[PDB]
Design a protein around this motif. Structure first.
Motif, PDB file in Angstrom:
ATOM      1  N   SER A  95       0.939  -1.172   0.000  1.00  0.00           N
ATOM      2  CA  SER A  95       0.000   0.000   0.000  1.00  0.00           C
ATOM      3  C   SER A  95       0.963   1.202   0.000  1.00  0.00           C
ATOM      4  CB  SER A  95      -0.835   0.140   1.299  1.00  0.00           C
ATOM      5  OG  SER A  95      -1.552  -1.068   1.540  1.00  0.00           O
ATOM      6  N   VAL A 120      -3.167   3.528  -1.966  1.00  0.00           N
ATOM      7  CA  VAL A 120      -3.525   2.669  -3.115  1.00  0.00           C
ATOM      8  C   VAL A 120      -2.567   1.478  -3.047  1.00  0.00           C
ATOM      9  CG1 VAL A 120      -1.908   3.944  -4.740  1.00  0.00           C
ATOM     10  CG2 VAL A 120      -4.387   3.501  -5.473  1.00  0.00           C
ATOM     11  N   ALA A 128      -3.756   0.600  -7.784  1.00  0.00           N
ATOM     12  CA  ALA A 128      -5.235   0.792  -7.732  1.00  0.00           C
ATOM     13  C   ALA A 128      -5.724   0.445  -6.323  1.00  0.00           C
ATOM     14  CB  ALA A 128      -5.933  -0.113  -8.714  1.00  0.00           C
ATOM     15  N   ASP A 129      -6.963   0.726  -6.118  1.00  0.00           N
ATOM     16  CA  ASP A 129      -7.628   0.467  -4.814  1.00  0.00           C
ATOM     17  C   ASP A 129      -8.313  -0.862  -5.113  1.00  0.00           C
ATOM     18  OD1 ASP A 129     -10.743   1.607  -3.434  1.00  0.00           O
ATOM     19  OD2 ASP A 129      -9.114   0.780  -2.321  1.00  0.00           O
ATOM     20  N   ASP A 159      -8.337   6.995  -6.245  1.00  0.00           N
ATOM     21  CA  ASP A 159      -7.308   6.968  -7.334  1.00  0.00           C
ATOM     22  C   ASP A 159      -6.808   8.398  -7.562  1.00  0.00           C
ATOM     23  OD1 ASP A 159      -5.950   6.079  -9.638  1.00  0.00           O
ATOM     24  OD2 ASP A 159      -7.789   5.794 -10.776  1.00  0.00           O
TER      25      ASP A 159
END
Ligand SMILES: COc1ccc(O)c(-c2nc3cc(C(N)=[NH2+])ccc3[nH]2)c1
Lengths: 9, 245
Positions: free
Chosen positions: B134, B159, B185-186, B192
């Motif tokens: 992350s 993210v 990305a999440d 984002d």
């Protein structure tokens, strides 16, 4: 005084 | 940034805000950047490509808001603007999208450390985190793809990095993404980076340090399913960075 990359606290 | 929380610069003390002057009286925001060393900020060549006149840009450090002043902010002029020879743009992607701006204040100095101004660490050659990590991104970009204004307060979000294999799937970006790019990305395609966030940092912890792992570069839409945001893979530009810094 001087920078320490990445340090916030 | 779509999603995220509003934050202050104390939380991202290496974030730099770059504006452009129109002597008509206004100065507008261009992109974000990160402070690498006292005199150097790194951003994305696509932010400057169209108007490479260094004299009309202003860089501010220690800024939590976009158009109002923050106590402790520093203003600089751009002494050198180094864009990447070999930068290329296609129907989506920007290649070799990294730029360096050397800053000087009106007194002739570089940035000074404070509780709102700090440098971010660089990775070692070709050293990245593993997919799944992350990382956080910060910026003054749009909060929704339909917005036509940028927020006034700095925002940030977390993210996760995904693999190249996943990102190069045909229903994602296919081969538009190279090994010199990173995708993040999440899991839930909820947060984002978006228009206005270009140039800012993708920071992850690497070997114990908060490292500038990527630079916000491009993406199809903002927070769209199977359309991650793509970042310039800083680990692969280290020689370039050193040749000039
Ligand atoms: C519409 O014209 C511009 C001009 C400069 C930009 O940086 C952008 C831009 N789009 C962007 C999209 C994304 C993303 N992850 N979807 C990130 C940065 C962007 N920056 C768009």
């Amino acid at each position: 005084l001087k920078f320490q990359c990445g340090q916030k606290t | 940034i779509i999603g995220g929380e509003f934050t202050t610069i104390e939380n991202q003390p290496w974030f730099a805000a770059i504006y452009r002057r129109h002597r008509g009286g206004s100065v507008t925001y261009v992109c974000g950047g990160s402070l690498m060393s006292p005199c150097w900020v790194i951003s994305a060549t696509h932010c400057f490509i169209d108007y490479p006149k260094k004299e009309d840009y202003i860089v501010y450090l220690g800024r939590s808001r976009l158009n109002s002043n923050t106590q402790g902010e520093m203003k600089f002029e751009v002494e050198n603007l180094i864009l990447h020879k070999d930068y290329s743009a296609d129907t989506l992607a920007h290649h070799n999208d990294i730029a360096l701006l050397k800053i000087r204040s009106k007194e002739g100095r570089c940035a000074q450390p404070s509780r709102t101004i700090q440098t971010i660490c660089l990775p070692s050659m070709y050293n990245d985190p593993q997919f799944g990590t992350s990382c956080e991104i910060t910026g003054f970009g749009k909060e929704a793809s339909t917005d036509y204004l940028y927020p006034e307060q700095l925002k940030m979000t977390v993210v996760k990095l995904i693999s190249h294999r996943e990102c190069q799937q045909p229903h994602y970006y296919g081969s538009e993404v190279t090994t010199k790019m990173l995708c993040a990305a999440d899991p839930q395609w909820k947060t984002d980076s978006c228009q206005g966030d270009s140039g800012g940092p993708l920071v992850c912890s690497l070997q114990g340090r908060m490292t500038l792992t990527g630079i916000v570069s491009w993406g199809r839409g903002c927070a769209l399913k199977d359309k991650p945001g793509v970042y310039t893979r800083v680990s692969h530009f280290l020689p370039w960075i050193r040749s000039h810094t």
